[PDB]
């Protein structure tokens, strides 16, 4: 994929969900038209998704130290990747996956 990712021919199947419509009271005399009056309704719940991953361990004889992703050592008004005073979560910067090195 050009955005980056894992191109799949059979990707994870998309999951669709809907509230089953519940009609408001129909008239007492039959009518051909479909029922246009419904009960205002919504649902809530809990969802869980668990992905197993396969890792390729880094095996390298490089002598000197790598470059690692490290949080800022210096003080700050609030922790990065954590809530602020108002409870708003925030992610301060995009984090790529390439800090290790290999030989080309």
């Amino acid at each position: 994929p050009l955005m980056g990712g894992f191109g799949l021919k059979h990707p994870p199947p998309q999951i669709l969900i809907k509230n089953t419509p519940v009609p408001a009271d129909p008239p007492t005399t039959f009518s051909q038209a479909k029922l246009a009056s419904f009960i205002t309704q919504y649902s809530t719940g809990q969802v869980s998704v668990e992905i197993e991953w396969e890792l390729q361990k880094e095996n390298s004889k490089r002598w000197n130290p790598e470059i690692q992703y490290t949080s800022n050592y210096y003080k700050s008004t609030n922790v990065d990747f954590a809530v602020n005073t108002d409870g708003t979560y925030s992610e301060p910067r995009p984090i790529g996956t390439r800090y290790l090195t290999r030989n080309l």
């Binding site: 490089r62 002598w63 130290p65 790598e66 690692q68």
Partner: protein, 104 residues
């Protein structure tokens, strides 16, 4: 068997990171001179000289030499040190193994 023309061992420097065990091997080349012309000697320092009372000592200097591997960087490459200190809370030695070989 061994002789003047067959080497006594092989060079080993490597680090085996296996689960909770890391096994670090190392090898160096050394030269051991003749100290004191094969003599033990009394050595001392008194306060009768320029030395002060805190700096006095009495002891012996032997012809023997000794191996000291007691520093960490003897056993760890800066990259093997980075894998250790970044990814683990605690570490302690378990056992060691020691070899002299290829004596000229």
């Amino acid at each position: 068997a061994d002789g003047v023309g067959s080497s006594s061992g092989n060079w080993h420097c490597d680090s085996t990171w296996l689960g909770d065990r890391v096994i670090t091997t190392s090898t160096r080349t050394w030269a051991l001179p003749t100290y004191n012309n094969h003599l033990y000697k009394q050595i001392s320092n008194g306060t009768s000289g320029g030395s002060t009372n805190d700096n006095t000592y009495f002891g012996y200097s032997t012809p023997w030499g000794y191996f000291d591997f007691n520093r960490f960087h003897c056993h760890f490459s800066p990259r093997d040190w980075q894998r250790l200190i970044n990814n683990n809370w605690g570490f302690r030695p378990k056992r060691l193994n020691f070899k002299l070989f290829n004596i000229q």
